[PDB]
Amino acid sequence: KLSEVRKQLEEARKLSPVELEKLVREKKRELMELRFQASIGQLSQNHKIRDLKRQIARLLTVLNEKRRQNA
Template structure:
C-alpha cells in the first residue's frame, strides 16, 4: 500500500482500513504463536501499513485544523 494511494481516501475510509489492518495484525500474531507463519514478514508489512495510514490521517487532520 502506497502513501499516495492513501492520500486519495477520506478520513473515514482510512479509519476503516486501519481497523481492518489492526484486526489482521492481531490474527497474524495469534497464528504465529499457535502454529507459526510461513511469511513472518507479513507482520512487519502490516505494522508499516498501519503506520502509513496513521501518518496520512494525522496529515489530513492537521490540514483541516489550519
C-alpha cells in the same frame, strides 16, 4: 515490495478521513489474526508481520497530515 509501498501511499493519500479510519481498524484486525497464527507456529512467515505493522504507521501518518487542516 518497494514498488507497492509507493502505491499504497498514492491511493491512501486521497482516501478521505472517515474512510481511512475504517481501513485501519480492518488492517489492525488482520494483524491480530496474524499473531494468533504466529503463536501456534502452524502457518507464519515472518516478514508478513513487520510489513503489516509498517502499513498501519503509514496509514496513521497520513491520517494526521490530513487532520492538520481538515477537521
